[PDB]
Amino acid sequence: ELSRVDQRHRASQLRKQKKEAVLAEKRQLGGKDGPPHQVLVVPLHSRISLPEAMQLLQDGTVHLNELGNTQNFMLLCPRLKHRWFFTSARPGDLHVVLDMAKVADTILFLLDPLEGWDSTGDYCLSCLFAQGLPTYTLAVQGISGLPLKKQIDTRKKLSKAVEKRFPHDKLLLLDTQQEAGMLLRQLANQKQQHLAFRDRRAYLFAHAVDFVPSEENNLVGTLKISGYVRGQTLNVNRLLHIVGYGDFQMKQIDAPGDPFPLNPKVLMKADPGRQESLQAEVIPDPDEEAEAKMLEKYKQERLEEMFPDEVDTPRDVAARIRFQKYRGLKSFRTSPWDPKENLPQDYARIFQFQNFTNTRKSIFKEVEEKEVEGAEVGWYVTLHVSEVPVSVVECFRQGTPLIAFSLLPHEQKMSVLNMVVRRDPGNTEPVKAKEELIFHCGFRRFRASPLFSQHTAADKHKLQRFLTADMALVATVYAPITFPPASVLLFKQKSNGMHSLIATGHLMSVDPDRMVIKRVVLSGHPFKIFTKMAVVRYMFFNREDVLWFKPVELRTKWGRRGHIKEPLGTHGHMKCSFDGKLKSQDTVLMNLYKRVFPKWTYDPYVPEPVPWLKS
RNA sequence: UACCUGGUUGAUCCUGCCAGUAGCAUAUGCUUGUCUCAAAGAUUAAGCCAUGCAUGUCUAAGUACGCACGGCCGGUACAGUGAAACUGCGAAUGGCUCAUUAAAUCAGUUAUGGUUCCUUUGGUCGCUCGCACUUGGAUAACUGUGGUAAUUCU
RNA sequence: UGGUGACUCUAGAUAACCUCGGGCCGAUCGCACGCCGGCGGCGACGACCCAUUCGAACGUCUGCCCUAUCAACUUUCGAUGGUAGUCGCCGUGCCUACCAUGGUGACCACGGGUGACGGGGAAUCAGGGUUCGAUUCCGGAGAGGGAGCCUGAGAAACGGCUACCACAUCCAAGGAAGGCAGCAGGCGCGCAAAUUACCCACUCCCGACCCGGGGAGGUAGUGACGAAAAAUAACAAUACAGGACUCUUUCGAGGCCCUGUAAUUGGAAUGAGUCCACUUUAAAUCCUUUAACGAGGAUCCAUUGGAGGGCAAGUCUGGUGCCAGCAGCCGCGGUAAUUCCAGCUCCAAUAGCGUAUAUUAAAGUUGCUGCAGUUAAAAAGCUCGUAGUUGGAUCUCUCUCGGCCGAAGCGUUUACUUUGAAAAAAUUAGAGUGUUCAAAGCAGGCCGCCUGGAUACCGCAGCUAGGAAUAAUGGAAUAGGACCGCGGUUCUAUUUUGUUGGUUUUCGGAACUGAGGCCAUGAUUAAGAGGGACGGCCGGGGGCAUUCGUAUUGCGCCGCUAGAGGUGAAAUUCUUGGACCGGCGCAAGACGGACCAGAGCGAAAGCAUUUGCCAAGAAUGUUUUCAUUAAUCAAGAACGAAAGUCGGAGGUUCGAAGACGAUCAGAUACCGUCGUAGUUCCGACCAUAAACGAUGCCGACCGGCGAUGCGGCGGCGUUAUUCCCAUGACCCGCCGGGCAGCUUCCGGGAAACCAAAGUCUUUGGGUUCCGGGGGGAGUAUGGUUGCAAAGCUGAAACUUAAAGGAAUUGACGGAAGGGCACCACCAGG
């Protein structure tokens, strides 16, 4: 490039460009045009009382909103030219923390001085890492509640206790109002993490919610979700999803006056009939017994880890009947399988994409590179919803918040979701393949019966009958369609409504063509050995059983590969050819493959979790 | 401690590089009980900066009429301490960074017989043949009236 | 007057000047107060100037990294110099005016780049060196970019001002205000870096100042950057296991034997911790010192990498099965996995240890010490030639002024060596001294004293004084050369012509000159260096003209002609007009065989018919001449096979291209028939080759042999029909310079091989070019030459663990021979 001025001027140009990008990013929050900065406060340890820090932090002009249980307020300061919205959460109550930490702009964690944090807070923090961190900001409370002598070593011990979970952060303390000024200054200017799962749709937080019942006996009426738009330009025709209560149609948007402007009734849109998105999720045209079962599950998992899929052939039931729908494959990787060969009535009830990647690109470019005529971000708007149950307002009076987000096109239909997911080491309870588990798949909450498979690059995926503690699996189930990326969480009712976390991951591409193959290997003990010829017993029990499964190729735990020549006895006595000679301590085994499909167990309603505790 | 080892071939002897070996410096991973030293926004961006601080100053010895004070003794010009303000000096030292800059900077060497110099130190300070037992006019400090949304504005 | 090495210095005299935007010659304060109405001691501030100190500012000599795909730069608008000025604190093209046309450069100017602030210095390192230095000390530069100022002794100052640019804060929209490359903090950038703490107590600085201020600085906080010390256990008895010793044939048994291992037993001793008190300190913290509690290993529990080779420590067990993976490299995985993943065991370092990148030593793989160039990567195609580098032998202290000495010249000038004085501290090497040891530190030690706080290095360049080998350079050869006296011309003597005005005092010194004497008067020698002469020759050395041969081709004539041409076979083609053929000729261009050699000449490319001319050329011979004139060469220049390219001529043969015919599962290579440019000559381009001895040029030493060419020398004998004298041709030697061969344990070398490819770790005669694993690639780009084709110079991105060189065997011959056997054959049974 030469000519030192030329290199310098090119560098100055690039500097200008990246500074313009950064400045264009940072005005989107906490300002005259920006929406308020939502800060969610979690006291991790049980010794901390959030009211103490909450009143140290509340002083600036305050506006104390109130709810049934939680207490969140609005803060406005022209000194820092900053609008804050502080909302408090309790650890263990994973409902509230999970469904309102996915819209909060910055999370402030409180830590006791003596210990790191509570085990319940440890569970909460594990779940929050697994679903996505907006911005964490470490804080402590009891540092100045001790003399200096133990104070410095207390900070040292906390710094020791944090580096195992948070890799490196400074611990910013809260004891005085001036320290709260330092913290507020810190939270005003942070390297904001763009959690793209928030940004790609039009998500809105509700400050007011009013129910106008059309008919009180029908227990359904018009809802007034008024608050701030925080994602994209929100459009009426796109449907609206409430995080705990499903996706449904919204009828009207108005824009009233904002409650808290930084420097101190008209309707925006009604939904046209033809341009509306239609609510069509499917195609229109068509005590000690539990302990004993748990021990049986333990024995089954122990049997299905040292032996992969060894199934003993029953001598009562005929073998070609019990494995009627199975087929044999020469090689798992290379042998073709038709994805449209055998389909039930369930895949005649979902929606398929001709090309997912093209559709995802088109939808994302239509969101980003195009502008719609809806209300812009930062606006204090009100949404009138035609169809909603009453009880959500009751929940709005309980203490849980309401968050409503406008969906992408084709996000309400049913499809076959595939979730890349690995087991959390905190839980060790054996989970079978077709169990009913709760998915938190990115603002959605539902029980499902998934199917676990390997996460390889090939076409066929062998079904996993149990969840492995290190291998990363793919959970496949009928589910409402969601566009990746998406944080995915797996929970189970342990006892008394305690949601236990098992596994977490991301959402992979959604398609029904990803077939899952269930395998069964049948064992046989070779009791006669010639050179490259063997006579094997106890694999079948009839005579026509060997004749039915003639073309299937036998393999061997010691690596030999063969194919059967003839049946000899009336019982299961079987002549087999081989590449080489078997050892005397050897077993032959034959692979049988079938296509397996997930169960249709989907329901959007979820029970409210109780506060989590350790056994 | 003036050192070498594996790798071309059927095998050998070579040229020859690749790789290993030791250092030293930055980053980073994993782990970390004592104790004494101790580097630390140089590299990328000599990019941008919210807020606080970083440069002030009085002796017996320039100017005291702020009762601001305890306080003389009373017509005692000025008893004392002394805010403020004028005056004098400093603020050009220090700190910071390495962008510029290739006989430039810089280093040793010489020169000012080609110059400037606060301060400090020693000299010089009735050499001059031409109201002074004390000269003049202001201006702050203070009193009082104000302007401007606003300033260490006036 | 006084002084420097040198003044246009300092001092003195005279004539004057001395700015109204002006120069000094106390209209000042404090402290005690006191003596014959007047005189006074001490201190503070001040002041024109001088000197000083702290500096600043310009100059001087020497010393920077990479680049030629940067070779000419500078000068209209100062570039180099001269004179006068302007401005400046001064010296100057610093600026102006007038002149002159200069100044720098292959000793690399000018232009670029730099991931450049320079140095002290850091890391490594035998010796040499290589790399780094933003960074606490010194010097410099800048406060977002440029610019211009105020005030002041000192600023082109930014914690001062004024503008424009770029950002950017408060508005009441009229305006106002900026500058963290200061300390903390944020954003941003990133692989990458700490507290919006406390204090002026230490160190020092500032002020009016025994008092005030100090994000300078100190002190704590974060801190596995790096560095020093150093715990995680010690002893005894048992209980086993081994090893030796003794007694026992052995098995076995003992020891006042050894060595291990024990969630075995016993006691004692401790620190990490929790905590008091003191000390520390500005107040603290820490370290140090005390009470109190505080330890049985089944924890107050050590990690990080590894166990195929390099490279220490397992062919241990289970799982996965050329999958997953491991592995820097070589490689492993395809089922007994020595390499993956676990367990156990073990190794390495150890409060540390992995990885990535940069750089260093290894790398004698950047070579000055100290590499290589026949075949592995490499010597230019060849010669000339400038700068550069290098270069034969030779030669052994004094005359005046002052007290035997000091002053003055030295001696042609340097390089070299040695000494001396100057060369910042820290860092480094290093002396001393129990920081408890140590890294450190500069302290400390003894009954108020006694001491330390050294030293060495500090390259080059510049001063200094000796040395005179070695290496340069000079002193007399048209003799206007030295040393002495004998004279002239001119300018001058600073005192002796008491005081003088003087034409003259004398004396002596300087520049040009005429003879004389004097010097042992003055020229080292002739390289087994070179040049140049001269003699006889010698050669396919070159050019011009001339001449000859033979073949081929064409034409004319005669004769016989029906086939001829070609091939492994064939076929295309010519011919009955008349081929091929045999002969007589003519013409056209070509080429100079056999002679022809391990010969010859030429710088190489290359050069072969006779004769003449032209100018060369080596070697030999010389008791010739010049006397160092030489070797190799960046730049630059002639020649340069074939092919090619421009203009002409001529075209016999042959022939790129192009046209036929054969040959087939697939032939398009293959073979034979024609045929254009070309091959030839003349004049210009082109400048490349396997341009090859795959071996730069010059010089020295180092084995043998017996042939050849040229020249010379010495010769028994043989031939010119015995030769009448010399003279050519054979034979035996010797010398010099060549062309080559044989052989050697000269020595080299990886070897093949080589009398050089030797005299090379026992490494240095001079010099030129050039190579750095293999590809990309002699490619792209740029410059330059060329009509063009092309040539010369010439990368990188990316890519691989080999590519390569010499020699030794033979699995195998689809290579050939033998030889064997009534389990093979002949004759047969």
Added chain:
RNA sequence: ACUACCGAUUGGAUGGUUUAGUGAGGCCCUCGGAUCGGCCCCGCCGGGGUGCCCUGGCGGAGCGCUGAGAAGACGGUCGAACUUGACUAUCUAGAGGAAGUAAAAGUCGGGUUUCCGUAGGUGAACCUGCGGAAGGAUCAUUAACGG
């Protein structure tokens, strides 16, 4: 569907040498005189020496004279910067062209020793034309020549 070249849009933007022009602000010079003060002149007056010499105060005009002096301006100078073309140098959106890659078992299917330099065959390999090399495997003979 994913890369990465070329490129229609002078695509736009910014900087360094610049040609020409314009030129903020400071400084210097020439001016200028908002004002402030003084020297006079009157009118009211008090004193001394004998209405006259000078005094203290007030107010007035006399463009009477004098000292200081602000704004502003011509001119010089340094000079940031602004506009216009050229040389550039760089950053940043793009219709399209030519490519390639993963996905379709979809349709049709004998010769040569090895080179080097040039020129032609069609760019290269290969072949041929001309000139060169070995880095490519030497068996047999060779005294007389006089009459």
